[PDB]
């Protein structure tokens, strides 16, 4: 059956992702960044993978656990969606830089501006700019290939989303599972059914 593995980076929003996933018809399995091996993940063979938000930086392994190898090794043949810490890990994984944000959005709603040159499955039917909750002090920067910037912060002007040139890897700095993100459900629906 359909299975979504959600790597829990000791988060307090991760189950908001699981509920949406379950409701979207996929069976969600939530396990923490340090409770399963990359080989073990392989053995479960999820259809897709979501790396949950979390405290810390991807620059420190104890913060992301198995999260970076998952992106690196499984990212090519299994779709990955990284949120907050996961979005940063996805960026870090591909040579992007991690830094503090100019402005601190902790539970604040930002206006995401899609800046994708070419259409994305993940953003199918999504308004050119929408509102989404942010819960982060750090951001991703110096995003070069194979990564591509997809969205941007209106007020702050920080990278809000990224994705790989060819792998089905996506990162969103904002929170689709938040009540503050209207189109959040849709974005997740897209990841599940169009990615």
């Amino acid at each position: 059956m359909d299975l979504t593995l959600i790597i829990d980076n000791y988060d307090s929003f991760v189950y908001n992702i699981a509920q949406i996933v379950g409701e979207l018809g996929s069976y969600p399995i939530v396990i923490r960044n340090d409770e399963i091996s990359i080989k073990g993940i392989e053995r479960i063979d999820p259809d897709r993978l979501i790396i949950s938000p979390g405290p810390g930086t991807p620059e420190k392994r104890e913060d992301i656990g198995v999260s970076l190898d998952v992106i690196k090794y499984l990212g090519k043949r299994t779709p990955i969606l990284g949120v907050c810490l996961g979005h940063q890990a996805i960026g870090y994984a591909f040579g992007a830089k991690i830094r503090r944000a100019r402005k601190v959005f902790h539970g604040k709603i930002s206006n995401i501006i899609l800046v994708n040159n070419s259409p994305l499955s993940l953003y199918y039917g999504i308004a050119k700019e929408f509102k989404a909750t942010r819960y982060h002090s750090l951001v991703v920067d110096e995003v070069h290939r194979p990564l591509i910037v997809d969205a941007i912060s209106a007020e702050d002007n920080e990278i809000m989303a990224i994705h790989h040139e060819e792998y089905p890897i996506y990162g969103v700095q904002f929170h689709p599972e938040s009540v503050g993100t209207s189109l959040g459900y849709k974005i997740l629906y897209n990841f599940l059914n169009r990615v």
């Binding site: 307090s12 405290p55 810390g56 902790h106 982060h136 002090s137 009540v179 503050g180």
Partner: protein, 415 residues
């Protein structure tokens, strides 16, 4: 056996309780300020030293159900210590306890008395010889014992905690401090004062022999009624209004508080998350989002979060899933609790824990154990905290705790 009486021909809650509280080692009074519950056991209580979920779970089947109005139709009443969360999450064990408190203490009433105020009927299923006649509330005198974290000590951990926030290891963390006093007298006096100054829908007085939990909880952890779970995240405070006018100007200050709303949003998301652990996917909803609730003294931004509990679940699962409240710990909760164990000087014990009941019908209700006085043998502790954020002022935060404690200081007679 049972007898319904007219509230008019009876005594009143506190009145009938004076006698009961003084007569038994285990008794409690719960008051809504709608219903009033007086219950006590003749067979002692339950001192839980293991995972409360497991332990309590084995007592739910034989629980006799009472034919009374209100969410509690018999069952077990007690409290859950904040440190019980250690069974449900990985938390550093560095600091010592202030006093010795079991992870939870519950009891199943041998006798129950329910006041249906809205109906003028008091239901008495109790083996009562007399109704009252024990004289009035005694005096209750205290004497300062110690304090855990004075202004600059507390102020510095707030500063420390701020680095973690800047670094991105927490959004908010609640740091608390306390005053302890030795005492003599009638602890009922404390409740009398609390009912008077800070009435609330979550009043309680739990007497477990040598230990007491006397408080007026400001917030509800969770409620389960006919398999639907509900919780109400609260954030932002403003005093009521001088007139139907100055009131709206305050309520609108909340409405326009970019800061107070952000903290509220996070709490709602955190609440939807915890419900998300035990609820049916697609049922966790926020029917009422960010509405100002007006109280007899203050007003806050409030949200109603609900969900449908999985069949495979219990009220005990809701407890562990929601405990401890985001407002008394922080976010991300696991980190926040570990940072707390790192910065505070003592394990919290009942403080920031929860107190409530599990109805014999599976329904349950638990309020956050704050704005409460914890008496344990020779010591009485008044505890309070403040939620730190990225731009929190160490001094302002110190005072929020001072302000919070002033109230408890008053309730205990220090002023």
């Amino acid at each position: 056996a049972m007898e319904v009486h007219p509230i008019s021909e009876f005594a009143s809650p506190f009145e009938v309780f004076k006698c009961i509280e003084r007569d038994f080692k285990v008794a409690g009074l719960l008051e809504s300020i709608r219903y009033s519950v007086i219950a006590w056991s003749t067979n002692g209580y339950l001192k839980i030293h293991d995972d409360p979920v497991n332990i309590l779970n084995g007592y739910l089947k034989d629980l006799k159900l009472a034919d009374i109005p209100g969410l509690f139709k018999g069952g077990m009443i007690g409290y859950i210590s904040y440190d019980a969360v250690r069974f449900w999450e990985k938390i550093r064990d560095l600091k010592p306890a202030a006093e010795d408190w079991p992870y939870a203490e519950f009891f199943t009433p041998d006798n129950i008395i329910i006041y249906d105020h809205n109906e003028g009927k008091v239901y008495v299923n109790a083996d009562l010889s007399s109704v009252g006649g024990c004289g009035d509330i005694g005096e209750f005198k205290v004497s300062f014992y110690d304090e855990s974290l004075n202004k600059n000590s507390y102020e510095r951990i707030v500063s420390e905690s701020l680095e973690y926030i800047r670094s991105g290891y927490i959004f908010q963390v609640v740091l608390s401090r306390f005053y302890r006093y030795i005492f003599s007298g009638d602890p009922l006096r404390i409740y009398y004062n609390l009912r008077r100054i800070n009435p609330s829908p979550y009043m309680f007085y739990l007497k477990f022999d040598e230990k007491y939990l006397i408080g007026s909880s400001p917030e509800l952890l969770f409620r389960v009624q006919d398999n639907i779970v509900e919780t109400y995240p609260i954030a932002g405070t403003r005093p009521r209004g001088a007139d139907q006018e100055e009131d709206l100007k305050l309520e609108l200050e909340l409405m326009n508080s970019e800061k107070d709303k952000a903290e509220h949003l996070m709490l709602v998301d955190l609440a939807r998350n915890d419900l998300g652990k035990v609820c049916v996917p697609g049922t966790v909803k926020v029917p009422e989002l960010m509405y100002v609730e007006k109280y007899s003294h203050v007003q806050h931004i409030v949200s109603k979060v609900i969900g449908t509990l999985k069949k495979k679940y219990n009220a005990l699962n809701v407890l562990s899933a929601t405990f401890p409240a985001g407002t008394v710990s922080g976010a991300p909760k696991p980190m926040a609790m570990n940072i707390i164990e790192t910065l505070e000087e003592y394990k919290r014990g009942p403080y920031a824990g929860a107190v409530g009941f599990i109805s014999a019908d599976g329904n349950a209700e638990f309020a956050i154990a704050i704005r409460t006085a914890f008496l344990n043998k020779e010591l009485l502790r008044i505890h309070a905290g403040a939620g730190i954020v990225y731009d929190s002022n160490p001094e302002s935060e110190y005072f929020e705790t001072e302000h919070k404690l002033k109230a408890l200081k008053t309730a205990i007679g220090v002023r």
